[PDB]
């Protein structure tokens, strides 16, 4: 419960699903790059980290920035990965 907090979570997606439904994206008026969670799966890999809620910001994945990434590109950036998804997540809680 602090601002400026980042969690680098490493997950292995279970049959093509970490467990987050993506929203936001550069196409929306976000911080010029970032995908965000709209919905958490109850007990996929993502929720099994669980420091996420339905508010947080994905800034980078596998060390790969969501720079210029929109809905489709953000999926591609999470989905077409080398199994391990190191999610660089920022707080969905404002200062």
């Amino acid at each position: 419960m602090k601002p400026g907090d980042t969690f680098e979570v490493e997950l292995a997606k279970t049959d093509g699903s970490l467990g987050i439904s993506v929203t936001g994206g550069v196409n929306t008026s976000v911080r010029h790059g970032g995908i965000y969670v709209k919905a958490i799966i109850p007990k996929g890999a993502a929720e099994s980290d669980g420091r996420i809620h339905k508010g947080d910001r994905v800034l980078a994945v596998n060390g790969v920035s969501l720079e210029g990434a929109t809905h489709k590109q953000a999926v591609e950036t999470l989905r077409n990965t080398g199994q391990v998804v190191h999610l660089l997540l920022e707080k969905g809680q404002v200062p």
Partner: peptide
């Protein structure tokens, strides 16, 4: 589209 489980 939005909201894609991945």
């Amino acid at each position: 589209y939005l909201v894609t489980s991945v």
